[PDB]
C-alpha cells in the first residue's frame, strides 16, 4: 500500500486558519492532495492540490469555533495519466473565537 505522509503537525490555529505541516521522507510523491470539512458536515469537502515541493499548507476562510477534519494524501503517476493516490495522513482540530 503507498504510504501516507509522515507527522501531520497542526499549529498556528486562529479563529479563520490553521497551519498544516507534513514530511515525505523520501520525496517519492509529485504532489499532494489536501482534503478538509467541517466535522459535522457530509459532502461539504473542499480538495486542493499542492505542489511535491511543499511541506506545508496554510487553511483559510475557515469558520470560527468550528471542528473540522483534514486529511493529506501523496499522489503518484503510474502510468499515462492514471494517478495513484497513497493511504491518508489525518487530523481534527477545532478554530478559535
Do not use: C
Not at 23 to 40: M, R, T, V
Request: net charge negative.
Amino acid at each position: 500500500m503507498l504510504p501516507a505522509p509522515k507527522n501531520l503537525v497542526v499549529s498556528e490555529v486562529t479563529e479563520d486558519s490553521a497551519r498544516l505541516s507534513w514530511d515525505d521522507p523520501a520525496a517519492f510523491y509529485e504532489s499532494f492532495l489536501i482534503q478538509y470539512q467541517e466535522s459535522e458536515k457530509v459532502g461539504e469537502a473542499i480538495v486542493l492540490t499542492v505542489p511535491g515541493s511543499e511541506r506545508s499548507y496554510d487553511l483559510t476562510g475557515l469558520k470560527p469555533g468550528t471542528e473540522y477534519t483534514v486529511s493529506i494524501y501523496g499522489v503518484h503517476n503510474v502510468y499515462k495519466d492514471t494517478n495513484m493516490r497513497g493511504l491518508p495522513l489525518s487530523a481534527i482540530f477545532t478554530t478559535g473565537g
